Design a protein around this ligand. Structure first.
Ligand SMILES: Cc1cc2nc3c(=O)[nH]c(=O)nc-3n(C[C@H](O)[C@H](O)[C@H](O)COP(=O)(O)OP(=O)(O)OC[C@H]3O[C@@H](n4cnc5c(N)ncnc54)[C@H](O)[C@@H]3O)c2cc1C
Ligand SMILES: NC(=O)c1ccc[n+]([C@@H]2O[C@H](COP(=O)([O-])OP(=O)(O)OC[C@H]3O[C@@H](n4cnc5c(N)ncnc54)[C@H](OP(=O)(O)O)[C@@H]3O)[C@@H](O)[C@H]2O)c1
Length: 257
């Protein structure tokens, strides 16, 4: 109103029939921290129709980016799927979220554990110089059902290591670990199963989580997150907050409404 900026769509790409990304302009007033979410959506019948969305773009990029589900009868995404370049969206002005470095004690390895659209905030974090200064390795796990749901997989593997500003840090420090559950692919499984078997650690070449070295951000389905939270706490890791830095922090990629 006043609670929103209007932005224009500058590009759009559909990954699958349930996943798409788009880029927009960015109001010069807008600021956020990598990992945060805002309310995004459309003016519908002169009223805002908005939903929580992670900001997928890099923190000082002159533009915004969203990585979105398409839910066929979802009030927002049943509309938002039909976006075209030039269309208007609205974006709220007060970012929030728990996916923040300072909610974590200092460490050596940051594991970004995601399913589905829960990759979104991590697309911002892995484009933040700050993360590479704070952590010697950043391990991005992205778990999906189908190989075509590995949104950004060519960008992450092939383009991002060539970035002028981030490329050498990414070549040296980012370990990208896509995994698929329901189609043939070189890496298969749920990240829960891959942690319990030890397979994750063997494949990325790092030791099993330890209290001194390893920190985690989790973003994905409620079920993944409840199960992975139990895994980490059984291993002695504690949830961080702003008042008390811990070893992991959690954000839902969506809620079952
Ligand atoms: C902190 C937070 C951040 C979020 N960030 C994102 C984001 O970056 N991208 C995004 O696409 N959504 C994200 N969501 C989900 C988003 O808020 C909306 O639910 C989504 O835009 C769909 O809106 P809708 O009105 O079409 O359907 P809704 O009525 O909101 O959702 C209906 C149902 O669709 C399913 N659902 C909704 N969102 C998702 C999803 N992302 N993945 C899988 N299933 C889903 C659930 O079954 C849900 O009950 C986030 C939610 C939270 C709480
Ligand atoms: N938390 C929930 O309530 C939840 C969870 C998943 C799906 N869904 C339903 O399915 C739709 C799509 O969900 P989605 O975007 O999460 O996509 P999805 O394609 O259902 O799942 C994404 C990836 O997460 C894995 N996964 C599922 N449960 C997990 C767990 N407990 N721990 C670790 N990984 C797990 C999946 O493995 P598998 O192939 O083995 O399932 C898959 O590889 C939702 O909109 C909703 O209707 C709900």
């Amino acid at each position: 109103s006043s609670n929103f900026n209007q932005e224009t769509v500058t590009d759009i790409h559909h990954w699958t029939d349930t996943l798409f990304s788009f880029r927009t302009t960015r109001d010069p007033g807008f600021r956020f921290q990598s990992g945060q979410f805002i309310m995004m959506g459309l003016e519908v019948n002169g009223k805002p129709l908005t939903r929580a969305y992670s900001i997928a773009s890099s923190l000082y990029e002159d533009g915004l980016e969203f990585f979105s589900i398409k839910v066929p009868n979802g009030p927002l995404t049943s509309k938002l799927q039909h976006l075209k370049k030039g269309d208007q969206i609205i974006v709220s002005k007060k970012p929030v979220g728990t996916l923040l470095y300072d909610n974590l004690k200092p460490g050596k390895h940051l594991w970004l554990l995601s399913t589905g659209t829960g990759l979104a905030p991590f697309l911002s974090i892995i484009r933040d110089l700050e993360v590479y200064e704070r952590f010697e390795k950043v391990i991005l796990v992205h778990g999906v059902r189908q190989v075509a749901e590995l949104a950004y997989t060519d960008f992450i593997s092939n383009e991002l290591p060539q970035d002028e500003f981030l490329g050498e840090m990414v070549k040296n420090q980012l370990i990208y670990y896509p995994t698929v559950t329901r189609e043939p692919y070189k890496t298969r499984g749920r990240l829960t199963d891959l942690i319990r078997s030890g397979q994750l650690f063997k494949d990325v070449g790092l030791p099993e989580f330890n209290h001194e070295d390893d920190r985690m951000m989790l973003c994905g389905s409620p079920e993944m997150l409840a199960e992975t939270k139990q895994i980490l706490e059984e291993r002695g890791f504690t949830e961080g907050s702003q008042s008390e830095p811990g070893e992991f922090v959690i954000e839902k990629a969506f809620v079952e409404k």
